[PDB]
Symmetry: D2
Subunit: 490 residues, 4 copies
């Protein structure tokens, strides 16, 4: 089955998830103003799959369980599937202008499926079967599964087994006959609080001495010992203001991060996908990161469509839409944004099947996609700020625009003065103009700048991470031989 | 006479300023958590003038009244005075990492001083004497004067006298035998609320049809009919949280903006510096902006020095300080920051005396300075984000770090888990690392990002405003003749 | 039938082409040292189609004539065909590091094919039959057809029918019962001198007043009244030096341009593909330029691979290859070059069939590919110059390196001193080092810089030409509505 | 005294300098086409000094000999002198658009003056007196002295004393009672062939193992054992064409490089400035390189003025001068060019006296100047190429434009067709349009590209050379302390 958005929300209310914020446990986190935006954002992935206008792109027949499923849970069977994933992601970014979270499950399912096949090939284990039966259950129930890779990591100069505190990468602390017990944490986890399950993977290649840190598994979000500590966001507490609407920029949607703590969690044998086979952890890292780097050529481009649209609208509202330099800046934003799309589509079109059978992207081209993602969203935002003008960051509050407090000589109110002085071109009301300038404030400096700017920098790895792999994947010694041939060198 | 910081703060509590925020009048605005950072920042200009270590830079002898005055009130008497102004601003940027506001007073005094001399030379008026006597009063009492130029402007495609609402540029609405009555507003005014006086200037050159808009004057900040509406800032309400400290990034200092409404304010004749001589409005704009564009070559460079420092410290605390790519990014930051300083210093060294006798910067080089200001701070922040890592935007609240709520199997509290998991290199405590990461959050995305990024874009004119003047000041026709000579064209 | 490389060259010797250089007719132009590199370069497209290792990419079965043909003459039947074209072009750029010219043929055939189909549907003409019979002749005989679009153009501020001299765009000057007479010229034509035929196309959209300029046709390269004047290239006369080899950088290959003059040339009815249907001139322009813009994503990327290899080898020869900064600059060159490739592959994968049934690229994504081509080759060259060092532009002549003239106190020769003083790592002989530095001189400043740098800037249109179309194709008003929905605006 | 340009040229004819090119000795090198543009270029430093309109900037009173001298031989006595140096170099760049060479003498005199003072203080040697007596000779005779620092260097990863060939850095090979004997070579030496004297300096800091390489001296350009080998330039042999003029771009001026060989040259005691005091080699390097880095802030900006003038004039001639994107690119070129000027002026204004008494630039700001010099000239050329159009690199030869060869049906000549087809706006003749397009070809890809692009990259060190010192000069640890203070860190 496929759940409606409404059924998705009701299922969360039945979970026993432990959520903490500002030193207190949140009992009704589903309705909490600082969390519900991220829930509305992933709820869109259920909603569009219910719409016939998008059902073909949003859903597909599973080859695993022979029924229709959301495309966010499918195993790629061709390069056409790789391209549709990117187009689906561009659609959701246009619809939400934020992080809609579900891509990490999709990308972890494909990386774990393929990696578990080759682990078993070598060691005679049964991880691939563990994973395959687990994905059947997710596909049967339309559940959200949080992919979690990045540990807190401690001292960046040392290996996992060289740290002063051995808990700073997640690790196995006991092997039982029926399961394992793990201890540690995963940081920066967008959407973890509103997931049904979590799938964990190691963050880096592992040597033999690091073998207890070579662990992968899946578990319910309310598993014994598991809890979450919310992470703050720029402008987060504006959502706690009574009547908050215009000053939010994006009232309906958002994405939020949490620290996920595993305080000695027991994993049964059939949920384990990796257990001390240190030589396959870097494979898991490479393939998950690769799919996530591909993903940004869809989601960031969709969000960039909305930023471009809001800057263009602001120029109309201000009255400056005919100026040549404003038109030229909008072309530049379009050009950079579509270059990102080109990298996402190209790494899809040049993909190939893994030994397990499912399709994977061209890893060099996905690395080039991500490297551009660390640069162009920042410039798209800078050009948006130019076009908008200074009022996007100096505007009085919404409470002031609606205030009936009298302040003028002839009985004029604060609200009267605000609506009068911030009027502009005849094509908008003052409130319409303020709404689009707050949308820009929110994604240029506010809660959504966290995703569009800083997650673009570090998501699926900081820039140096891709540069190291681009050098290895660049074939430079083969290129030196091309130069010898042209220059006349034997 | 020079005031101490304590005396400045006491002088504000005697003022009757009308300050409104979220629909309510703020009675004790001097102690309001969202406004006091602003006050502490300007108060540093008083504090350092009391320190013999900085006494030389911070003070000088008045050429109008002979006494020692703060350099922020001095008429420049050489290009050595112009370079010292820039160096003074770099120092205050290093000490506050924010906008310390007082520069607009300095820059308005020097522009209105030289322009009023020329108005009088032509029309037989007395505005130069009016201004000179006014500046003696300021020099005697060490007061803060808010320079206010930018109107709301309404429809950007129309002239001031063609707007549908004639009040969207500030204008003369009555002329009496003893003074004038003005109506309108000035937007984006940083430090307006904690000034003793305001000095108003027009925002663009004016035609004869716009002559009611060619007005300049000074007035006390509590003159009758004058009031302010606070503008919001990214993360502003973090300041209202109980025990707010680490999560603010910059707890002591900040710079906040407001809408200044002139609800039929009367100005006596001795306080008028321009009154319908429309042909000199453009001169006032050119010179005030020219000095403000010079000013950024000192203040943004000193703020930049702290950002560079914080990024370098974060690398040490993370443990990644020996990596070649981190070292190269710190060098790039340093290079871009010093390029700004070179523009600031050069436009100063190439300055010259006005007819009135005070010194002015090279207008072309100051425009080049500000054009680079619209670009390099944004790249300095992007590089800082890279070096810091993801925790800068996903960190739990300081209340979580301090929380004794028990959540671990063996009695561990929320505070213990945060302090354990976010530990890094042995060079810091966890709290120290969280403090530098929050400083970076605040200036890359939060309340200080408003000044370091978006005011760098629009302060003293959006980028296209300098480009238009660089073309005019470029001597392109003379350069075409250089080319003809070399290419052998007659 | 496919021709061998040697048969291509002998076929050129039978033509009566009229070629002029430095004021004289060149009778044996096939062996002239300043023209033979162009011929050697095109000749590789025949040579590689004879090698079974490349034969699959270089050749394909024609649906039109029912035999295997060179892929450079094929009408695209699928997006797979569009991706193979780009991959073939990367292969040839790796093998020659230059402009191998034959792409303009391929690209003109697909554009004229799809355009003439639609002219005929609207007007009842039979240009589509004229064109398919002509393409049959070209496919049976394996000939080179130079696509010629860009006129000299005259005063850039005026339309073709408004020029002072009506000949500055090519036009019909007479209509006869058996054909037409055309007069004018096409400038900048790479490979025109070593083509068997020419296919002419208008350079811009045309109005009714310009209808005599709306003309397209094919003619033999030795048609009566047709002649060529060679254009100069940087370092071109180094090819005239006795024993020239090392100082050429690329001895075997190059690409040279000429002015093609139509001195009242008669075209028979069967060779005419457009004749005064002004409303289809812009269709031909958009489709030919769109394919050529796609082409750069393959050819400049293959050339870029050789430049990267040459810089990397120079670092090995100099002995600086282990330096972190050198490594990082080679990664930047690789990243930028592969970004170009992604744009070439993506506009191919997102392609579609025309009404005529052959496939065409996504025009927006091709425009994005070309816009990046105007930027990234220039930066790849700059980083290559950094890595190579100063000797690439101050090296003594190869005549000095082999000179036996005695200049040392103990009998040492000029050649002795040059081989001694410019030695470096044991990895190379001095001569080997000089060979790779001369390759870089030739592509960074010399003969190959004309194509890798300046043709990247202007080929298939100057950058503003793509910016105009990106605005139209950018769907900006639809993006404004996305922003409204997020911001809460009706 | 001061020589006239004609007297300078005549003095060269009396030198017995040994010059070789293409395997042959050149006896009359003063009139050789490939060398005379270099001589004309330095000759302008004499011509301008004879001009009353320029004499005050071009000449100054020597405090060493009490007479009027060319400013290119002066020891700086103030920061005003440092600024005037920069302005004189901008003037000469405007007048020649090339490398006028004499700066290296000026910059070597000031660095050797100050360094020898400190050597003598530590070792009791007489090098300072040797130098001051030498500069008196140069000032009384108005001579050109070539500063020569860069050796060929061999394996870049090894120190001079670790090279396999010990002559790849210049060294002392014999010490006599009356002087020393030196052996080795200096590469890349611009204007070496037409200097009267040479002044040699080491190229890198030296350890005790390298003490035989710590050598500095001066010698006549025709000293026994000294000779030069010409280095090639892009497009060099166009100067050998009969009647060469338009196709040269810059017919009168240029700057060429040579390998200077020291084949066991004797240097008398009174001409030695450093002889194995290894601990002072690094000081001489830092000071000479810092002055030359400052110099680019003037010379490349003067050349950049001419490139901006030539692109603007090309737009007028083409007829595209009203286009907004053309205007914006000319503004961009102007902006980047003046940014370089700001760095040149700033490092001058922030100068200071050495222990010896003459003034030196701020070394950090000169390093910032030169780092921007490695970037901005490349972008200024790319934009000029855009504005010019493709004809700058595809134009027929001047011999074709003048050819009377008949090729038209009606008797038209090759020259007739060229002058006809390459006409454009009414503001120019075709010949005037071709002259400016050829100037741009010559500095974007030809002979002047060597200087404006590649010497901007490597002269006074490759980019990495400045980045290493910016890290050392950046006070990063002091900046960390500023961040601690603001973030609340003890
Ligand atoms: C046209 C021109 C004119 C010149 N005129 C003069 C002149 O008149 N007088 C003068 O004395 N000099 C002159 N120079 C020479 C100039 O100073 C140099 O080119 C440069 O300082 C010396 O470097 P190089 O040419 O040996 O290059 P290399 O040192 O070989 O540099 C190539 C690259 O390798 C890197 N590299 C090299 N060594 C190391 C290392 N140890 N560690 C890490 N990376 C390394 C460099 O940073 C660079 O990226 C001129 C240069 C040019 C191009
Ligand atoms: S950042 Fe993008 S790809 Fe990653 S989970 Fe969010 S929406 Fe998806
Ligand atoms: S932005 Fe800078 S120059 Fe302007 S008032 Fe603030 S601290 Fe001063
Ligand atoms: S520039 Fe490239 S696409 Fe065009 S004809 Fe040359 S090799 Fe082919
Ligand atoms: S490159 Fe410039 S500073 Fe150096 S010698 Fe030439 S003209 Fe002077």
């Amino acid at each position: 089955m496929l759940m409606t958005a409404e059924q998705y929300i009701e299922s969360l209310r039945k979970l026993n998830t432990r959520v903490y914020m500002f030193g207190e446990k949140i009992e009704n986190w589903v309705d909490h103003p600082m969390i519900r935006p991220s829930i509305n954002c992933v709820r869109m992935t259920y909603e569009l799959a219910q719409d016939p206008q998008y059902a073909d792109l949003m859903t597909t027949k599973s080859n695993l369980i022979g029924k229709t499923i959301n495309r966010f849970a499918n195993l790629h069977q061709s390069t056409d599937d790789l391209r549709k994933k990117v187009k689906m992601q561009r659609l959701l970014g246009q619809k939400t202008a934020s992080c809609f979270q579900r891509c990490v499950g999709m990308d972890a399912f494909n990386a774990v499926f393929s990696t578990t096949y080759e682990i078993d090939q070598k060691y005679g284990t049964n991880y691939h079967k563990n994973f395959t039966e687990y994905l059947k259950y997710i596909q049967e129930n339309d559940l959200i599964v949080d992919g979690a890779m990045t540990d807190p990591k401690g001292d960046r100069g040392l290996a996992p087994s060289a740290q002063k505190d051995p808990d700073l990468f997640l690790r196995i602390v006991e092997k039982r006959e029926d399961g394992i017990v793990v201890r540690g944490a995963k940081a920066h986890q967008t959407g973890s609080i509103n997931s049904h399950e979590h799938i964990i993977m190691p963050t880096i290649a592992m040597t033999e001495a690091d073998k207890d840190y070579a662990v992968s598994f899946a578990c319910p979000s309310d598993a014994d010992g598991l809890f979450m500590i919310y992470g703050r966001q720029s402008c987060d507490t504006r959502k706690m203001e009574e009547g908050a609407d215009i000053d939010l920029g994006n009232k309906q949607f958002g994405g939020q991060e949490a620290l996920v703590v595993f305080d000695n969690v027991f994993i049964p044998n059939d949920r384990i996908f990796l257990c001390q086979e240190y030589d396959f952890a870097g494979m898991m890292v490479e393939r998950f990161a690769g799919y996530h780097r591909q993903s940004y050529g869809g989601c960031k481009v969709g969000v960039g469509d909305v930023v471009i649209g809001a800057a263009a609208l602001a120029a109309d509202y201000n009255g400056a839409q005919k100026a040549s330099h404003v038109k030229d800046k909008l072309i530049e934003m379009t050009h950079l944004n579509e270059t990102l799309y080109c990298c996402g589509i190209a790494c899809s079109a040049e993909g190939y099947p893994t030994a397990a059978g499912n399709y994977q992207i061209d890893l060099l081209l996905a690395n080039v996609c991500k490297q551009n993602i660390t640069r162009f969203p920042y410039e798209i935002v800078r050009l948006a700020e130019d076009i908008a003008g200074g009022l996007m960051v100096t505007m009085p509050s919404e409470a002031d625009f609606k205030s009936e407090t009298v302040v003028g000589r002839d009985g004029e109110t604060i609200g009267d003065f605000c609506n009068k002085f911030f009027a502009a071109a005849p094509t908008c009301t003052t409130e319409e103009r303020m709404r689009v300038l707050r949308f820009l404030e929110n994604i240029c400096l506010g809660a959504s700048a966290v995703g569009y700017r800083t997650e673009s920098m570090h998501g699926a790895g900081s820039p140096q991470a891709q540069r190291i792999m681009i050098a290895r994947q660049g074939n430079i010694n083969a290129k030196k031989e091309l130069a010898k041939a042209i220059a006349g060198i034997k």
